[model samples]
Target chain A: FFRNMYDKYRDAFLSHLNEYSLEEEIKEHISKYYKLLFDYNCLGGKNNRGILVILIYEYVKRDINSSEWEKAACLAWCIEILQAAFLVADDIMDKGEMRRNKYCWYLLKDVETKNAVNDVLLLYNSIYKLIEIYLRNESCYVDVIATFRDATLKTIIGQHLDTNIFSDKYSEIDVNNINVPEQPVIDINMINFGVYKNIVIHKTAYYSFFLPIVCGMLLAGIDNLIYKKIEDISMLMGEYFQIHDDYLDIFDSTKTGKVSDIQNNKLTWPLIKTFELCSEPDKIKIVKNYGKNNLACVKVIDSLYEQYKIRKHYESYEKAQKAKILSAINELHHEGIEYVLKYLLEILFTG
Target chain B: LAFFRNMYDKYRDAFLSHLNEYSLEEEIKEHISKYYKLLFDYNCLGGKNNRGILVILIYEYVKNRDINSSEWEKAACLAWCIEILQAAFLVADDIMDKGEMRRNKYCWYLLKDVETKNAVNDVLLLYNSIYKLIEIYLRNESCYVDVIATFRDATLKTIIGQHLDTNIFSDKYSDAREIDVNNINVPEQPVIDINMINFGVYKNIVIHKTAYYSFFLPIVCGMLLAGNLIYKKIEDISMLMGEYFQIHDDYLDIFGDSTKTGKVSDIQNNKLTWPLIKTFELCSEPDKIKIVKNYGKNNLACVKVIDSLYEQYKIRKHYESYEKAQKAKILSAINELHHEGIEYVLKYLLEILFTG
Candidate 1:
């Protein structure tokens, strides 16, 4: 389904790092450390995010020159690197045990939490240096960078929300303590579709959907009211994608390659949907069984989820979301952009 | 300080309203304001604002202009952005070090709600806030790209330096070049590698970690805002000052009072400090084994051996003479700059830097 030029793009970025001005002996040390950092984190079995950039860029900008694809591929790999950055940071926050079928980077003995923190910053920054080198002369450079920055800021905000929405400080305002001893419980008020969309759109929509698609559009020299429409469609798509993700966390951690949304006390969609429809006794049952680390507690929440039919609700929700996204995509009034969205929708899961 | 502190709210408010425009509910909006405002203040406050003040000083000295509040606002925003960068570094650096206290307050990571996880996330928040502030205040300015590029380049230099400082002596690089990513069980023993104890490696790590962000960046920020071509000579001087200042800071880190510096010792932390380099060069191979054994240890007895070793090598006397020579050299470079206003600012800033 996908065949993006992964190795060439990886090499182009690595070549820049290799030539970076460090003294020779130390350069060996530095290059060795960083080379492993990039290779370990950047290469993934599923590179849908990076490939999205390439596919969109190809369709939007018709007849792209061969060398120009180098610049386009720089951005494509940058999104991949950006995913590496956020994924490491996400693993750190979620206390995740595995990523991409391997041990989490932070869990490695050589790369502890501290080194992982610095490495993520390095990976995050390598994006800009690559952009600066490859697209320095492009007119779209500034807006392109701004899109990445704005998306990241929104992502961080959504991360804070997703992390803290269930904590005790959701309705409280006590900033003096700086660290409120947060308890991982679902805030009753936040257990709704509206709050989930707010978190999902900010966290996933901007970076995942809008960033890649808009990058292609910017490279194609299309800047107008179309971006706002693209953003709206991206938000819906983001919600669709994340709700599916939350479902996978509870239902199919095997395929998703990570586990423990229930054990982690995450404010996931299954929990949200279960709360909406479950009996008051079952709601209390959820409040008790959710967020516990024990296997029996998680099994209770799992059994409760199946009882409430979250899988069926998710089936309906995905259908509605796809319809809404298609409605927005059709209103884009641009043939190539609409075509790319339709193509993307087909592969939103498997690809 | 007066002009800079007063201008803080304009940038902070601009960023606050930027957050408010995100279609968040008012309840969460208020929480963001309350939380992030404290995030900015708790970390951004309490520093001497030396780096921030340097930008303000250099801008005024370089421009010598009939400046307006509008112009100063731009300058002050850049100044505060540097301050924001400093805060971001200190926060993350503290977590990396697993630190306890900073600037006489508990480390941000140690706070109740803001443990390492939030602190990690907030470090990114503060770092990104710098670019957002620049975009808000100086987005249309001619030197915008140069300015942001300066920040990015300086920051990358610092990250590399931090990596080197943390891992240069670890077994991964020093003993054997075990560059394999899969080996998590290499038995990481923190010890002084004889090869890495030289001044050459020390200077490279120090210049990147301490020089670029702390010295070169702020001066370049002011001149770039003032529309001056970045002088190569000026960059050389900035590196010199950076080297001098970092060596001195590392000296005080070992020798100076913890009450004054408001932090614990670096010796037990296993850092590649200046005193360690000086002593390593002067000590024998047996003493090299002494350092290898005693260094990077948390026990008081191991720390005592290193402290006594420093006394044996007269590291303090070496630092005194090194300071006199570096000071003279930096002054000569400053006098050759040929700009009287900047020359004076550099001189005045140099004298007050340790105190301020």
Candidate 2:
């Protein structure tokens, strides 16, 4: 559905530029750049988050003849555009080399870092343009635009918490130095466990999981009580999704090249749980090269995870999460919604 | 105006406290708190503040000088919003322009505490904070939606103008590279030809970047606060004023002394300006050919060529006449205004033209 919808989306995106008539060459060049930017960044991402918009609308409304699908699809594209905008800026902030296993857009040889900033703004502006183009006449337009805007605000705040590692409060610590195990137990818990969870919920959960579903419900004109109920479920799904993401960051066999959460000393779920489970001597040994690129240290950490049965722990945890989501889904007792929610759970959890 | 200044102080303090209230990690909170401090101290606090003050001036003009009321406080906060918006734009502009100093101090991006990577985000934080301030103070206003839409429109216009100014989508993309500022005196052929016929590019950039935000936005915001929705009348006046302001900036780039104006690099930087456009109109065909060849190169010979062409074409006299005509037109608009309070805005415009 997403693949087919994108063909229509490309037409809508290009049509928004029809009102502006500039010099022929200048106009042509801008069109080409926008097309290039959209194709390169927006199209390649997994469309699960975006597709959820239209899918949720269809499930909630359950009317085959409804004509709002096209508009809902455009909203989906807006979500994709918002995602692309955040990713572009985030890559620049993180000094990331690659994204989705390719050179990050900002790091491309032809693109300067400065131009990348404007490009990100361009992508952001396109979201509003898309809204005005497709949904301006809809009664829910203001609410939709506000929802997207608030999501962006929250995401930026989340990013602030996640990437602000250079605070002068940690002035005594060097970037190269990993935390010591004995570096004060209370500090480790706050930094590793507490702050880590806060970052995940804010940065990943809201934008990724909550935004698409909530936006769909808004578009469908769902009641406030039902909306609030779904939002709680979405938040749980988002939290579970992020914990799974953290687990994959370490154990996923497909990743390569400085991408590990452990390698970056990011407070991932697996590492935090490992810290919780480790003995004092084992924790001391693990902390020595937790953030460093040491093969031997990684081997030790992996061995400890095996001994602690962390993967087995994730199995039990995943089952409990699946049960929780299923219970929520069954209680709602709408077959169409049940089917869609179950599919979302399968795609998100099985990944 | 004392009340306005007091409101600014109150808003500044409250804004800092708002930053503290975010549920950020302690380390992140400490970092952002310092970032906000630097933003306040270095970027926001020091401007001549005519754009900000214009809101109060225009608001009082429309409101019959009820300065001690809640309406005055709202207007003051809105004015502070404009200042924060300008500060945010300048911070981003300094990074793009590679500016070394601003207001006789280091640019925000050049500050010792900021990484160049994080500077962009800091500017974004300031940009979003504008909306937060609006929501805090003006959410109950009947014109809240209109005011928010006005800001969104202005921001998009400015971004588009910045796109053109940087020539990112234009032919200069071929020559975009790291710039060295020490060679400002050298004149080379401008990387792009912005001739007399192509004055649209220059005007479009200036109107979108300077006119709408600097001129139209303050007046519109003030008018909205005054419960007036008929803002289209002020648009033409503000746009013309914006064009004149930019023309003066372009004029000063060539004719003004470096000691008088900090530094003049429009020629060396290959910028499109009014004087250059006028020179294209007035200079001989051979002189036009000469300028095209020697416009933006970082060589003293190129500077001498463009300078001599300006003199030969009597561009200074044209600028004087243009400035006089614009001043008269602005004063004429002010004279037509029935409200005496709004009339002082022309004085503010005249003062900015002379100094800025």
Candidate 3:
């Protein structure tokens, strides 16, 4: 049912977008770039984030044929566009090679680095365009727009922190303050605990997990008591979801592409703990292998993880986090919203 | 007035304090802390402050010259916000255009430490700062929605205008080397090459890019602050003044001294400036062919030929005539406006902005 709704929503978005008929001259100005826009940036995603929006609304409304369902679908597609907007920029900022098992949009033959910057902004603009077309007349239009803008600002701030995690500017605090007694590795300002939490929650969790659910509740016009509960649950869910992502980045064998967190010298949970727990010789070994796409290095790092029993730690961490979520669910007074959240949590964690 | 400087100082400090409150790590904090100082120094401190000052000027005029009212503080804050917004736009523009200098100093994108990647973030940071100011100062106002929507619409229009100006898909070759007969294969050439390539393109860009943000925004912001919401009255005059402002900018690019305007790369970049289009329209076929060969090459010899064509077409005199005509239209419209005090302030601003 969700799959069918997403297919229809994607069609509806494209049709609505087509209504913005450009001037003959203006059309000529944008024709070459549109090929990149449609083919690369928008088309290839798993559509999970976009699909989640419609699914949540359907779960809430329980009526697929409601007159307002089209509006809900439009909002869903807006979420997809927002994700596209961030991913395009994020890939460029990270110098990312692949997205969704394809060459990153910025790395396309015709698209050099600079063109991707403008293309990202264009994707950002498309979100507003969709909202103007579909939801401008809704009573909650301002609230919806504010929510999107707030999410975007938070994500951008998070991205800034994430990118600068490796810069020389922050090295002093990052290097000197490893409170764990055993190992010290980089003079570089490696990301700290606070920065890592903000990076994961702001960059990945809030927009990905929380936004879809909050948007669903907003569309349904749920009361503030229910709204506040959903908001808290979504945030906790978002953070836990990110923690899981950190685990998956290293341990999940199904993910293709390079082991990006390690290759990119990312401050993932595993890497941070690796730095904290390893001896001096092992810390140096890890630092030497950091950001190098060497198979031997990967083996060494994997063994180090085994040596430290990091996966065991992660399993316990996941158990604790999952318990917190389930407990939070139990405390929620509203059955329907709570049930919907549990279903989402199950899909999220099990997947 | 001296009070304007005081208002600017207050706004700047508030913005700085707001930035410092982000609860960042010590190193990240120090980095961004320095960034905030540089942002203030490079982006906000310079420029004519015409857009910023106009906000205060119009807001005062609409309130019957009341500078001491509590509402006046909001106007000042909004004005400073607009200036910050322009700073953001200018920073991004410099990066995209590969500009070397602005206001006789190195462009922000060209600073020794900063380059394209960080410049992108800086531009975004400036944009967020604008909204932060608005949310702080004006969120409680009755006209908050109108003000926010106005800024959003203005931003959208300006970006669209910028996209058109970039000429990405128009099939116009930027380098003179690519202008071969075999290379001329634009499918939409008939529509764009003749009709839209001249005044249509120039006017559309000026109206969308310059008109909304520079002219209409400040005045409409003033009206919103004054608890007045009459946009129809301001639209035409604001648009006309915007066209004149941009045409003057294009004119100065060719005619002004190199020391003043920084560089004459508009000629070398094959930019769709108003003067170039006007010269194209008035040039003879042989002259046009000569231009097609020589334009967009970075050399004095190429520029001289373009200059000769402009001189032969009397483009400078054409601008003088255009300015005279627009000035008259503005005066006649001012006579038609209901608010005399606001009209006078608008007249003063238009003259100062355009006459120089």
Candidate 4:
């Protein structure tokens, strides 16, 4: 049922779109375009975010029925839909080539950057429509929509930080002229762990962890101070998840599906680690070569990561972070939701 | 007008103050607050504030009361929220249209530090900030869900309209069979499809694109806040005014100066505009061939040819005649509204939009 819920949710949203006052001929074209938009972007991913919603909802709610399952699954896919919206927008902003190992939606000639922009909004707005259709009568409806809005707003701010951390605005180290832009360079001030956590947690945790978990809890009619504890746990899990994603980007792009972080001048954990331990000359090397599009420039930073035993540092950090998360998870006190979180951590990538 | 304009900073500061409470460092908070404060001010200000004013006017006149400061606060929050929505759409629209200027300044996307990437994310930030602002000020209001739903539905219609405006003449839509959903790997060539160069299709694009958000949403926001059921009559009038407004915009793109409009002329962009439709209708068969050749190009000579055809067709004269009939017809609808206060505001808005 969980596996098939993707289609059920996709068709529900798609059918809602067809009912717009468009002519039949116009409607047919929109259907074809968006069908491919969904199939291409929403599917073929590890449904990690969507599954978090489902697993949490199932574990949290003892009382269940077909209607409840329907509402829960709709929430699950709405997050996925939100993820799809973020992915499409991110691909354009990052100049991404492939997503889920296929051509980025913006790169598809038929759906160029312009249509992709509009489609992102369509995808975002559809989540509310789906929720209203399925969960409108639920007492938690307003809270549920608020959760989505709050998480999305946080993510946007987090994304603003991610996109601009190195752009001369936040770069204390650089000077930017009005007419000509400066090259992408890492701000030494921003390379620390404090700044890294600020970006990743807001960008990742709230939507990825807090929103889904809270949706599960809210629909279960459980409202208590425990949510504050869950918020802490979600931030830890978000940081844990994002740090690994950064580790994989430079350490094993083959696993992550894109070697984008270094090429896109991303702020990643490996770069920070390499900067922390590298020689003064190597730090100089990073400043010159990091964030450049040239292979030779990127190779200089890649070589430093290897020389500094960055992977060794990552293994220890991963060990440390996992323990920290488990400590918080054990403190949560709710056995059912705790079991789901533990199971999720164990099968995070495999699922 | 002054009361509405004065309340901008209060709403902007409220959202920023919420962001300040996040776990971000004190220094980092300062940086973000400065950035987003400018984000709101630079984009949200400088509009005609027609959308915001409409929310204010409608809320004031929807029901008679000596509305207290508390009531005005709630109404003002909704007014500013719609203005925030307008700001979001304009920023994104500029990017999609390769816009050069907006509000007499460089497009937000074109700013060196802002660029397209942050600008894109900023659009989302501005948009979501509307909801967050509403939550801060009006979360406990009885009408919150319906109000939020109205914003959602109207934005959905706007996106659908934007899709139509972008791709009505796109190869995928014009040659629907060509987009083999099985293999959407075909290359799209951008050019105007003559079959779509008509007013009927134009209304489909404009009404959805322009009518719903620009007219319908703001109006509904005021009424819903006043505990009034939305009227079918006003919804009908919103569509007429939306089409009316977009047609005027089409006219201004060619006839108006960039210094005045604060936008690069749309003539070079291959958009399906009203002038294109009117010229297509009035031109000869050879001229249709001429338009098909010269219409969508970006070069000077190409734009010159299309401009010449518009002048030859006396598109200005046609628009003048269209505006007169449209004003009378819209006034006729306003009279039918019978609710004297709303009728007066609608009538005032008609003249204010064009001649104020």
Candidate 5:
């Protein structure tokens, strides 16, 4: 359906493509460099938000058979564009080597040595273009215009938060650690409980899970009931998703990078969980392990997962919540919001 | 059709000709120009000049409504405002992009070889050049705040967009390498949904980056800032045109030729175009699998795969209809505006359309 819309209104979407696409053969060559970068970094993603956009357009659009299709398609494309922008910058921060098993857009041999600043600019401009299209609405508001405006800023601020912790700039992040024969405890003290958790929750869960879905729902003008329900469900789901992600980082190789490594000693859910379970001497062992790339240390940490029985605990927790989510979705069937809810939960859980 | 065609040719020529004079002044220009010769030789370099024409069109619209010399002059300045701003933006964009050549020469930024800070500074210089042009042409304090607000808003958004994009798509893909369509949750519902992931590319451009600076502020804002008679009309026209304009460009990116349309290499580089994005959305399990196998600019396999897919999909018609719809909407909006002043504005627009 998305492809249909894209194919259907492709000219309009492509116009934005050409707006900045260089005309000079030489510039075209360079633009192609950036263009290819976009293809690598931006093109294919789950596009969960894109789905919501199309759903809303279909639902609230009084005249979907008419021009509303283009609007929805554009809105859907805008979400994809923003996601692309996020991926492009995230690759820079993580120094990601490959994407979709392809060489990283920034790390690609041709673009690696090139100045990355302007490519970044084009990425940024892509977002502006998305909002700028909305400005065409006679009813467009400057504040509304500013809605997605903070996406990149918020993302970077979140990144900076993670980075500082990675570098140990904050004393609180490594507050304490302990080890037990069966379990280990490590608590990196965060300066402010509210700020730390909020940063984590907002940056990771809210932005990733909640914001994109909510933003699309809002754009679609879905009723207050369905919109708020999705929000409530998604935020909790987001929290759960983050926790599951942390688990996979240690246990699920298919989801995270490698089996395990001492480098994983940095802040993550598993480390935090272990700190809650370990004893004091073990905490020292944890701190000493920071920045250590030793194989043994990584195994010890992985062993800690077994010691704490985190997998069983998480499984029980996920199972319980999954039931609640499923029941909630089933109940929504009468309300006409079931499929979207079911689809979203499936993606979040199974994917 | 001839009128539109001629307008395109003129804009292209003027942009190409103007580019010839760009780096003539300073030592930096001389040095960069030497290496940029390849870009000059191979590429067609020049401004799109669309904004420049919009200015003239808006001024004519306002002029027909009422006779205010001061306001007319301001609109004219706004027109030049678009031109000057784009020049600065493209120059900086090229530098930041690590473009080896533009206008068939070594890009000014790349010529520096080592001191890349100048490239950064060059972007700033280009921004400052806008004010210099404004001061020389419009010279009105009344609209200064509006101008500042508009320009700053666009700049800030652009920066944020750039930061997010660089970090996510370009830099972070490896950490996310395992993520693909198989894992991607496509909505299964009675309604064929528009996936949020689909917006990844389009939103970044139209909203955070292009439509405002390129379409909204320049076209609509210019009308209100100048107190033009058609403030409402500007609002209406800009809204339609902004979408239309962007949609048109997207079509050209894939279908248009590099020599005539003046854009190429993106298809080679594996940077996405609208068609590719659409294909991803429409693709089945086999289609998705093939894309993973052949994605990248360097891979001829990927390029050929795309070509074959386009053939199988009949993607050309998709874009053609999009263009037709945009043209219809644009004309409909013009009719709704109910003004010949809009026609004059279009004449200037025609000039810039040369590049298109």
Candidate 6:
């Protein structure tokens, strides 16, 4: 049921976007560049979050009614919009030559090359244009605009948090001081404890987990109690979901066809702790092997953790969080929003 | 030191609570902490906080009093937009300039681990920041049109300017006439030299490169989501200021202390400042040939050539007079705009901003 809803939503949403360029006066401008950007960003890549949008709508609305189908469609397209915005900016920032095995949209071979900064501005407009389109109307405009604004901002703050974390590590901060006051930009030191929490909840939670579902629920006119009831429960569930991602980066399938998390030298949970725990020898070893091989790094780090039973620690940690999510899901049973929250949690726990 | 100590705690704490404590269980918080620390390194860089200062300036202009909590929150969100934009630009510029340091720190793109892909990520991250800011501060539809228009227009024009600049440095255009179409005419001196205008080479470059990004964007962003049509007049003021600002920059590039700017080689890059362009206009044909051949990165003789031309043209005196006149024109334009249909509060923005 959710699958069919996503297909319909994807089609309807893309149709509006395709028609956007067909408008008479501005067709030349929109058809050439903006349309191409929208098409590549909107529909390109594996549609994991795209499917999640459909599932979220189903969990919120309960019934697969026609009216519910329309709401799900609008919100589903939003997921694509969100994804497109990310793709345009991410491809540029990463200097990624290709996406889905094609040259990046911005890396046009034929056209004159512009500044990387300018490419970003173009990518930014695509999403802002989406907001302008939806917010022009009188009905459901506030809700739609609010959801988009919240989700996009959440992603930005998440991005900022992620950026600040790496910036702190790259700098020479005094271990004793930890707080580098003389150099003003050095303030967001990752050692400050609170920064990581922001990345997950503000960035990932809203766009990835909560906002999609909450927006789905709100659109379907589900009671306010439903979203409130599921907030903490689903939030933890989303955290577990991200933890699994962190774990997979270091110890996942080599044949996964995904970018190597280790190669990226990303700020992941496992590596973060290893740094905190390791001796000076280990720290030097880690830096030396940063670009050598991810599998090699993974083997060495995993072996180090195995010595301390870190794998068992993670499994137990995962189990505890999952259990907490279940307990929170239980509270929904007393309210009218129970069935929706129940199905959502069942997917989280079972998946 | 004390103020920074407090600020560090506040920005750190806000970033954390905002991210929901990394969304992991307490046991794994340590790992989350480490992961985030690396991520943070790739994100931020230093700036004069000029953009941030503008937000506070505009907010006070509108509210006419000290910032309340809501206004302060709005200021922070707007300031974040500027910071994010700068970070994205820095990542790319680092690649282009092969720059080693930004904001007195190592460039994010140049970091051994980061490579070019992080540059893409940094740019995307910046855009996401803008959306996040708009969502939190300007969610309502009442201000939606203004905010969207301001951001979109500024972004598109900036990109066009960037393209113009890339062409200029790379010598992409075979024909010189094409450059003239890229520029809009400003009020000329006693003689409007079409022969000089026909040279059109660096004239358009100044408009798009320094003017749009540095002046137009920062100024317009402050007016976005404003209650009135302040953005209407800002278009004129910003472009003029942008031109004036670029001219000042051109003069400084040739004469300013390289130690202070952290970049010692200005001539080697083949950059054409207004002084240089103006000098090219008046130079004898034989001298013009010498200058063109000399135009490249680290042309010491050509650098001296530029210094000699500056002495002849009295470029510094000319720039000062030009700037003062433009300032008066800007003020008159603002004064006329004050009587237009925009709200009174928005009109006062000109008064407050112009003092700077």
DockQ for all models: 0.51, 0.17, 0.17, 0.53, 0.03, 0.15
User: TM-scores of all models?
Assistant: 0.96, 0.80, 0.82, 0.97, 0.48, 0.60
The numbered model that scores best in DockQ is 4
Q: Write the per-residue lDDT of candidate 1 for residues B1-356, one digit (tens) a residue.
A: 78788777777788888999997878878888888888888889788888999999999998577889888889999999999999999999998987777887788888777777788889899999999999998999999999999999999989988898888877777655464456556455576677787777888888888889998899899989998343788888988988899899899877887778776657777888889988987889999898989898889999999999999999999999999999999999998899887888899888988887
For residues A192-268, write the lDDT of model 4, one tens digit per residue: 89999999999999999999999988988885899999999999999999998887777644555553688788889
Categorize the docking of model 1: medium
Better of 1 and 5 by lDDT: 1
Measured with C-alpha atoms, the lDDT of residue A50 in candidate 2 is 87
Worst 10 residues of 6 chain B by lDDT: B187-196
Native-to-model Cα distance after best TM-score fit, residue B346 in candidate 5, in Å: 27
All candidates' chain B TM-scores are 0.95, 0.85, 0.88, 0.96, 0.67, 0.71
lDDT of 2 by residue, B256-346 (tens): 7655655326666566678877788777788878987887767989888898888988999999999889888877876666656666765
Candidate 2 at residue B237, lDDT? 75
- Write model 1 residue lDDT over A1-351, tens digit each, in one string: 123565665566567656755678888777677777888888864777777888888888546777788888888888888999999999998899888877788887777888999988888888898889889899999999999999999999999888878776665334346455656676688888888888888889989999999888788788488888888888888888898888887764457766588988887889888898989999888888888889999999999999999999999998888988888889988887799889889998887
Expressed as tens digits, the lDDT of each residue in B234-253 for candidate 6 is 66665665666666666666
> Which candidate, 4 or 6, has the higher lDDT?
4
Give candidate 6's error at residue B75 in angstroms. 7.8
Error of 5 at A328 (Å): 7.7
Candidate 3 per-residue C-alpha lDDT over B1-356 given as tens digits, one digit per residue, 9 for 90 to 100:
45665687677767677656654566556676665666766678767778877887888778665456577688888888888878888887787667777776777766534555567777777776777678778878988877876776677666656666655323442211221212212232211233455676577777877888997888888778877335777887888888888888888888887587654367665567787788777778898778777666667898788888888899999999988998898888877888887888888897788432
- Against the unseen true structure, what C-alpha lDDT does each candidate score? 0.84, 0.70, 0.68, 0.85, 0.50, 0.52
Q: Higher lDDT: candidate 3 or 6?
A: 3
**Which prediction has more favorable lDDT, 1 or 3?**
1
Fnat by candidate, in order: 0.45, 0.11, 0.08, 0.56, 0.06, 0.27
Q: Which structure is stronger by lDDT: 3 or 5?
A: 3
TM-score (C-alpha, index-matched) for candidate 4: 0.97
Could you give the candidate ranking by TM-score, starting with the highest? 4, 1, 3, 2, 6, 5
Pairwise DockQ winner, candidates 4 and 6 = 4
Name the weakest run of 10 consecutive residues (lDDT summed) in model 4 chain A: A171-180
